[PDB]
């Protein structure tokens, strides 16, 4: 049971060894490019030695006994809601890209799956959906205005209202004439030739 270290006297069973991160500041060199996610730390603490040294000595547990260790870990992070690493800042949505009359006076409506980006960091649900709509508006601004795409025919629009609330089966329309402004659940509004993709995007869960 003799768990022994070189300089000090041989300790007996059930001691403690600590893996902390500021010890990283100490053998700085070793982890010049590492983060708290993965790092090299000095377990050995003796106070005699300067912080840099004493990191080469090894703790030995006697070979005759098969040693096992308990473990308790402490973790506390800060991850934003929208970020590049967690596949939340990007999403693909096919939209109308150009509306130009042809020689036969027949209008031609092109389409293109264009990837979008969101400033990382915006957080709340409302704001997020709103931002996403912002990006769409943006694509139209960059290209529709240019190729002459009317703002009426924006393929993709996000909303949370229940459009059939005022629906009346007797007539087939909405008698109040305005959709009720009460949010229910994130949903997507599409137009012919447009759509949404989430193959390599995670905001799916947010839209629910």
């Amino acid at each position: 049971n003799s768990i022994r270290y070189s300089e000090l006297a041989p300790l007996f069973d059930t001691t403690r060894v600590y893996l902390v991160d500021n010890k990283s500041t100490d053998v700085a060199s070793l982890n010049y490019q590492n983060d708290h996610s993965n790092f090299l730390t000095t377990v050995i603490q003796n106070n005699d030695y300067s912080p840099g040294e004493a990191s080469t000595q090894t703790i030995n547990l006697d070979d005759r006994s098969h040693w096992g260790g308990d473990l308790k870990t402490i973790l506390h992070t800060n991850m934003p809601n929208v970020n590049e690493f967690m596949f939340t800042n990007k999403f693909k949505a096919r939209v109308m890209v150009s509306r130009l009359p042809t020689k036969d006076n027949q209008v031609e409506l092109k389409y293109e799956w264009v990837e979008f980006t969101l400033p990382e960091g915006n957080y709340s649900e409302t704001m997020t959906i709103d931002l996403m709509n912002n990006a769409i508006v943006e694509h139209y601004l960059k290209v529709g205005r240019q190729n002459g795409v009317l703002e009426s025919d924006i393929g993709v629009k996000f909303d949370t209202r229940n459009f059939r609330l005022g629906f009346d089966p007797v007539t087939g329309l909405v008698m109040p004439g305005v959709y009720t402004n009460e949010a229910f659940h994130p949903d997507i509004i599409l137009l012919p030739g447009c759509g949404v993709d989430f193959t390599h995007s995670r905001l799916s869960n947010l839209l629910g």
Binding site: R4, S6, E7, T56, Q57, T58, N60
Partner: protein
């Protein structure tokens, strides 16, 4: 220890190479098994003691 050296206008390091003993014993009992027993005495590090 106390060293005394001539001045220079740029940072310098002094490298003392404490000489020591440092050996490895290679133990290979079965096919495809290697066990090493390190040792470095004046600056203790390794397995045996």
């Amino acid at each position: 220890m106390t060293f005394e050296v001539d001045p220079m206008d740029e940072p310098t390091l002094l490298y003392v190479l404490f000489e020591v003993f440092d050996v490895v014993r290679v133990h290979r009992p079965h096919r495809g098994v290697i066990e090493t027993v390190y040792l470095r005495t004046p600056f203790s590090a390794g397995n045996a003691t």
